[PDB]
Chain length 255, copies 4
């Protein structure tokens, strides 16, 4: 059963989610006031009603809830891009990742979830304000067990050794190629997300310089179309998010 201090997701009659901590306080919504105390001693799958009689269904928070409801500061990496980073670099339970910059911690949360409680993520960040926001998100999602933030400029070096992956979302990933070459295990991946084609060009210039340290690099971009499926009309949604950034992969190989 659910206890005071536990987190839950409440789903309103419109399907909207609220990720809350269970306490003895009132929670205000546009559908009325909820007495959060009523959740104590209930089980997931049950429901409570607001003072206006609207039902809120109780679910266990999942990674999708934390990602969707986290506090956002610097531009987050979209789940579609995190998905392809994890898929094409083969990111796996138990991996050791160096990430930079932590930003809001959205990519950090996604990677931390995948690596599991015995994996490790060390995220570099130069902006101490952003690092504080990210750390609040990380603690909130319960991933302070496996994530550390370093307030260090990663262009100056990577301290960690025998790293499975170096995953980058910062302006000049070319400034990290040499450090990543040193830090990565044989067969580990360097991955960089970059909004601009200019950045892809600069990164590939640096990867060509370091050609004997990596397998052939690959750059992709991912588009996800939503479909509208009504009884009498299936068609793609009219508008889509067609660009976030390019993703470049290079697998480390010795000599």
């Amino acid at each position: 059963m659910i206890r005071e201090g536990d987190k839950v997701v409440l789903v309103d009659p419109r399907g909207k989610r609220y990720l809350i901590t269970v306490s003895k306080r009132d929670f205000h919504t546009d559908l009325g006031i909820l007495k959060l105390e009523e959740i104590i001693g209930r089980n997931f799958g049950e429901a409570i009603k607001s003072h206006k009689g609207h039902e809120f269904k109780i679910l266990r928070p999942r990674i999708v809830d934390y990602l969707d409801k986290m506090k956002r500061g610097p531009q987050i990496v979209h789940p579609k891009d995190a998905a392809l980073i994890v898929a094409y670099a083969g990111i796996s339970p138990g991996d050791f990742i160096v990430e930079a910059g932590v930003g809001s911690g959205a990519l950090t949360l996604f990677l931390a979830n995948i690596v599991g409680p015995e994996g490790r993520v060390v995220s570099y960040e130069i902006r101490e304000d952003f690092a504080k926001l990210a750390w609040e998100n990380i603690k909130w999602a319960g991933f302070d067990d496996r994530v550390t933030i370093k307030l260090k400029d990663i262009y100056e070096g990577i301290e960690e050794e025998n790293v499975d992956h170096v995953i980058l979302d910062l302006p000049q990933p070319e400034r990290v190629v040499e450090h990543a070459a040193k830090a990565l295990k044989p067969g580990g991946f360097f991955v960089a997300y970059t909004p601009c084609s200019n950045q892809v060009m600069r990164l590939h210039e640096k990867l060509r310089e370091f050609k004997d340290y990596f397998m052939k690099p690959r750059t992709i971009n991912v588009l996800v179309f939503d479909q509208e499926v009504k009884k009498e009309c299936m068609r793609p949604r009219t508008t889509a998010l067609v660009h976030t950034g390019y993703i470049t992969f290079a697998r480390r190989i010795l000599e």
Copy 2:
């Protein structure tokens, strides 16, 4: 160090990978004969040469190697689609998944890797020939610790209870909606991959019938463009894989 019986990835001078078991035998390539015995007692990152003097670099097999080099029978789910299944359903270490049909086991391998050694995948399959091929792939990748195959028609029922996700790649996923509703935990996901728009239509008809058992369903399709980045010319690759199948998600919610 590497021992006889261990698996390794050998990378040839063109960057081509071979996923092999280390034994005392000759391994024939288009670049000459390798004495696999020479790998015994070496460490990852080292290399051996063929009888023609071509170097093969030694790497630890990762999930990407098993997925790329597995034996294929029935049409596999592409990594881009597996990536979005895992991302948008929040598939996580420790999850319990019911999958059908196992097919070649490509999606099974991807999901098994994500759920980790304490997660579980039960994959249903009606074709015993396909089930045998998939099981060989699963044992080969070392995931027989966490995957079971059931030779059962899933349209007749799901035996498992309190399942995190029901993940489908078969012709008529609408025939599984009612069973999945029963099997899924509150907040668990039903996910179905379907090549044809006709199938999406039939599935949504069934999900509308079961509207009080799920949150609003979402159907997507994912396109991944490769970029060609040469010193004097960056452009998308001329041709792309633009369609594999649609992916439909519906999260279980009670009443």
Copy 3:
């Protein structure tokens, strides 16, 4: 030189266009009042200023100006789709086209421009209110020389014979296939625009029935991405119009 009663395009300092008729009246803008009389006796390429001193440059109206500035009622066919209709059916100066329904006349204007003053477009329309709006657009663009509107339900028949193309944007183009087969010249095109995949399915069912009257049909959909090209960053625009409708072509062939 420009005379009273002529149409001109005025381009403001932000690049915004106004398509106006030259008269002796004041024209109000957010950048001040223009004395349209000042345009009489000027030549294209010259400019006038508003009472606030903002310059408006004078250009000859082109088809792009009429299409961009026309009055819109029923949903117009987007220029990208009209472009592919004209390209893949080979629509040419001098052609005779039957169109339905006229709608706002956007597609009509595009086709009328391509066929030129010796071509002909007969556009069918059942809604007399829409037909009036379209006819105002057609007269405004000066294409009443080559376009006729028929207030007739095209599902009941096409009166015209030896037609180069039958071009459709209405809900049930399958109801026009038999009539188009009769009306079209050998080698002429039947073309239908349809937002929904369901409509494409119904249309292809009818085209299969009429397989001995047409070459193999082809259905496409067209996506146009805008690129943002700043000095330090080139990337696709973040959001795009990814779906308007499918376009189906079938070329008439006898027996």
Copy 4:
């Protein structure tokens, strides 16, 4: 009726087209020998049979036939891109176009068709071998009435004045911006097709330099998806042509 020396399209039972000149000779196909003399005195829509009894249906050649069946040398501009050039620049019957380089004449044929017999295209070309091939295509399609080829390097200047459009497919369109500014009518379009993002960047650098000569430039790229529509399965075709080149438009405006 058809006369000796006329061109016709013959359509075989598989739907394949042959664009031929009618003479008294044998024409060999994989479906047998045709006696082209049998076409003399027939009308479009009729048919002839090969010596093996396979029927070939007779159609009047249209622009789509000439474009599809022309001789190709240097890489042609794809019809989808020509379509958007014509649509977004508003290319119209009677226009005067300067094009470079002529290449194989594919874009030339498309533009010549649109401008009609009273329009004019002057195409520049430095390779005399390519110019000869293009001119053969142009004469073959009957557009030598309205197209001229100049064996001149367009980077050295445009001789023509009061041009409606300058349309470019060559490596360094930035070298033509100043000449086009001089040659174009007020409101005329400069349009350039460029495969590489690097070229788009260089072109926009030059257009920024010439900002007071043009309206804000726009760069697009066009993707056309084919749909497979079978009775029991509609889906996009698996593979598509996703990249040919970017198209940049800038409309001329004085001062």
